[PDB]
Amino acid sequence: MRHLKSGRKLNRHSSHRLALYRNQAKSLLTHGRITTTVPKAKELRGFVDHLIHLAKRGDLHARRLVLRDLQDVKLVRKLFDEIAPRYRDRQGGYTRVLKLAERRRGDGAPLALVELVE
Amino acid sequence: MKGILGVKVGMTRIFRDDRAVPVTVILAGPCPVVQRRTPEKDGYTAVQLGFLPQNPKRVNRPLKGHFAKAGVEPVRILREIRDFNPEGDTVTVEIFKPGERVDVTGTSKGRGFAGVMKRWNFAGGPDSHGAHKIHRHPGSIGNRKTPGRVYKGKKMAGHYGAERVTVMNLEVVDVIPEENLLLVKGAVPGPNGGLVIVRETKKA
């Protein structure tokens, strides 16, 4: 039974799953767009939206919060100065997932793109 | 034999004569009768009740013709109450008064593939003293060459729940007509949001 339980496990223990999301966020926020597996990509949306939303608030507190996950001061500088302002009037939905047509060869895994919205 | 269709909304308790009484709240009415079953026509007596309004765009043509014949708006669910023939063209919680006893039927929570300990309260095995990988196992399922087979109905692991269950003789603690609310004392099968049927109890 999994009744009303939220969140994927992704066959990772607690600290790996966390490090997975942080790392993907760094990669997403750096390149603005990445390719991953559909389930990982779906899970990324919420994690990154929260960070972006926090960047929109703009205060010192938000920056330190965001920094807990992102760790990279220059990246967070980019989040606050460049990324966050393009979403000033957009209420949620800062990311988007679109499924790719072709599966990965080695393991048949279905892929998706995750990108920051315009 | 009155009955009504409903949704299980949630549980609380109320206070009645300095007693905390646990209740399940049910949103029961209002139910339009969209077909009557008669002895001449169907061989028995019952009323087909409708419940929860549906977006017409989701209702296909044969179902639509069924509703229209009743002069009735499209509805999400059709269910019959056996041996019931309300005078009106609409059944509401008003058919019940506080103090009446009711039977409630719902779909129990699903446990999916359930073990012998969860499904049947088997004792399982020891957790030490040498017990070897059988902590939750059924143990023996039979005898030997006689009868050399396993009984039909043997209690074994398998799907458990998400099945029809009726709980009987529940006290109607309150009914709040302006909200189509029924308060029944105690526990009713299934999740909040679940579809239930409330009927006058068959126990005397």
């Binding site: 679109l98 499924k99 790719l100 047509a101 072709e102 793109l113 | -």
Partner: protein
Amino acid sequence: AKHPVPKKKTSKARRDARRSHHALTPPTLVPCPECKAMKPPHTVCPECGYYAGRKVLEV
């Protein structure tokens, strides 16, 4: 346990009957409204990179 083992060789009939559920179902495909190529629905067109009537991907 005590190492269960098949009592009899499975016959050609029974072996092949077990496989009556093994045939693949073909991939489900729709035409891409832009370039008319067949592709799975709800995926980005791999041939022209369009989805939802716009360019998404360098292809």
